[PDB]
């Protein structure tokens, strides 16, 4: 017998403290605000990019992958296998939506620590990645040059737009068929007689209320209201969902509790295409709510982002 527990894992804590360590060497803030005291330093802009990672047990230990269809996420597995390192993972620090991760071969898989506990998040892993296109346009600087006889060649540079305003695109049709699929797995978990509803985030720090993430060394915040508004019966056919975003300088650190401020955006264009691999959900029941369950976007704890991709692994001693 070999019991697994993704929620009381220790690779999840190990990787967490490592990924944080990466940032604090490859991404310096112009001023950080922690423990009351404040430090300001020069901050040369750099193109940070999510670079693949293999978790590797030390000399004398082995990792164990469980390859069972529709895995509980916890509890004894049968078709286990030994490894040395984990298949490359992309350390995506993001909320509301998990990006560039592994998917299910079969159907959608909702996993949780406690389903009945409405304070516990619901890791929803997709079986078919939805594509999202985020980008800050090069709309802003209006340069031009006068060409003519006897004309000298200078260039007139003046900015006319908000250099911080971006947007993302999603396939309306894909996303709709995606939600309707999660609601199916939820109904087959809380009851068929139950009704399903998605509703936006309740409130809190910017990073949580709005699907945040990093791209091209810049911090995005995307008003994901269009995303999570669906009542089963409610750009109707085949169009293109687009949501508003904004680059911010003043972000609240995820590493520890506090704020940090970075340099303004860099000239040019900023574009990232990523796979929506899964979503962090959260539930809310109040002593029986008539007969209908609502679901909001979650996220904010990065141990969750890790756990979604380490749920099959367990490190063990080879004595």
């Amino acid at each position, epitope marked *: 017998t070999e019991n697994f527990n993704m929620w009381k894992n220790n690779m999840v804590e190990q990787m967490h403290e490592d990924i944080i360590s990466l940032w604090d060497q490859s991404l310096k803030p*112009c*001023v950080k*605000l922690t423990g009351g005291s*404040v*430090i*300001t*330093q*020069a*901050c*040369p*802009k750099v193109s940070f990019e999510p670079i693949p990672i293999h978790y590797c047990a030390p000399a004398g230990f082995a990792i164990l992958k469980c390859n069972d269809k529709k895995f509980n996420g916890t509890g004894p597995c049968t078709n286990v296998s030994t490894v040395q390192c984990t298949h490359g993972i992309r350390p995506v620090v993001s909320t509301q939506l998990l990006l560039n991760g592994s998917l299910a071969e079969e159907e959608i898989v909702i996993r949780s620590e406690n389903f009945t506990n409405n304070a516990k998040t619901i890791i929803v892993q997709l079986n078919e990645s939805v594509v999202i296109n985020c980008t800050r346009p090069n709309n802003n*600087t209006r340069k031009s040059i006068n060409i003519g006889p006897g004309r000298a060649l200078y260039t007139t540079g003046e*900015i006319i737009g*908000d*250099i*911080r305003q971006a947007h993302c695109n999603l396939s309306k049709t894909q996303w709709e068929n995606t939600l309707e699929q999660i609601a199916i797995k939820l109904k087959e978990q809380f009851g068929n007689n139950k009704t399903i509803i998605f509703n936006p985030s309740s409130g809190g720090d910017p990073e949580i209320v709005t699907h945040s993430f990093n791209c091209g060394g810049e911090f995005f915040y995307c008003n994901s209201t269009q995303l999570f508004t669906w009542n089963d019966t409610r750009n109707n056919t085949g169009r293109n969902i687009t949501l508003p975003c904004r680059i911010k*300088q*003043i972000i609240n650190m995820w590493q520890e509790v506090g704020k940090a*401020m*970075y*340099a*303004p*955006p*860099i*000239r040019g264009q900023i574009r990232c295409s990523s796979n929506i691999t899964g979503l962090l959900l959260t539930r809310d029941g109040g002593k029986d709510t008539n007969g209908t369950e609502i679901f909001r976007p979650g996220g904010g704890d990065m141990r969750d982002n890790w756990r979604s991709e380490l749920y099959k692994y367990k490190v063990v001693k080879i004595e």
Partner: antibody, heavy 130, light 108 residues
Framework: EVQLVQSGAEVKKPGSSVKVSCKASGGTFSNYAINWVRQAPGQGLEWMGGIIPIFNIAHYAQRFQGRVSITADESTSTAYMELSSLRSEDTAVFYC???????????????????????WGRGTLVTVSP | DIQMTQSPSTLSASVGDRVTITCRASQSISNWLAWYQQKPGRAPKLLMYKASSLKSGVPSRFSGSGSGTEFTLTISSLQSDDFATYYCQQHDSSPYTFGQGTKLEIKR
């Protein structure tokens, strides 16, 4: 133009307090990061404290922790730096320096954030005599 | 905290003569330095920022060089309007430290 205006010459007997001013003639106030710098007679430059452009946060050197308080008056677009408990050694000149006010809607420099002082107050001498 | 040190303290320099000033740090601070000129009884004014980058409205005879720990302020030709004191600031991290000071005088 875009200069910084400082208040006049102050004369204080030990044990009192004085609050110096510093107006921003041009540009936009929220773009300025006004840091105060001290220079004692026949002595070199010494940094004192400053505000954080988009924070309102004011941080000071350890030497001047519980003695100085730098405030910012948005209405009149003026920055103030009061100094409590005056002694004889604080006789000095207090400039208000500040990196050029680049518009908030502007692509980032290569320095990331400019902590060098582009603009300087004319000079405010403060003598502490009985 | 970072300790700044200039050289030399006093400088008996002639006219037109090419001269270089140094400034060494307590740690590696990249290329984040700045040189200030200050005439007697007057507010200091910035010439060189970014360790070597000149600023708009600054003469061409002034040349900043170096990086890491050792830095240099070089002057090609010398006029009668360059006999002031010079300070090195380090706009790397707070607290921002300045230089000791070097008085550029005349020789006879």
């Amino acid at each position: 133009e875009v200069q910084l205006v400082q208040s006049g010459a102050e004369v204080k007997k030990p044990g009192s307090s004085v609050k110096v001013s510093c107006k921003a003639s041009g540009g936009t106030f929220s773009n300025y990061a006004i840091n105060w710098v001290r220079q004692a007679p026949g002595q070199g430059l010494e940094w004192m404290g400053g505000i954080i452009p988009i924070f309102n946060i004011a941080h000071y050197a350890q030497r001047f922790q519980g003695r100085v308080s730098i405030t910012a008056d948005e209405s009149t677009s003026t920055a103030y730096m009061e100094l409590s408990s005056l002694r004889s050694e604080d006789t000095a000149v207090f400039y208000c320096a500040s990196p050029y006010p680049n518009d908030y809607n502007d692509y980032a420099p290569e320095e990331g954030m400019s902590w060098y002082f582009d603009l300087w107050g004319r000079g405010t001498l403060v003598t502490v005599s009985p | 905290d970072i300790q700044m040190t200039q050289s030399p303290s006093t400088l008996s320099a002639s006219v037109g003569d090419r001269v270089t000033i140094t400034c060494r740090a307590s740690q590696s601070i990249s290329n984040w330095l700045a040189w200030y000129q200050q005439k007697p009884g007057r507010a200091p004014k910035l010439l060189m920022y970014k360790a070597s980058s000149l600023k708009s409205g600054v003469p061409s005879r002034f040349s900043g060089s170096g990086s890491g720990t050792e830095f240099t302020l070089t002057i090609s030709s010398l006029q009668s309007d360059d006999f002031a004191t010079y300070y090195c600031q380090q706009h790397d991290s707070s607290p921002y430290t300045f230089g000791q000071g070097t008085k550029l005088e005349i020789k006879r």
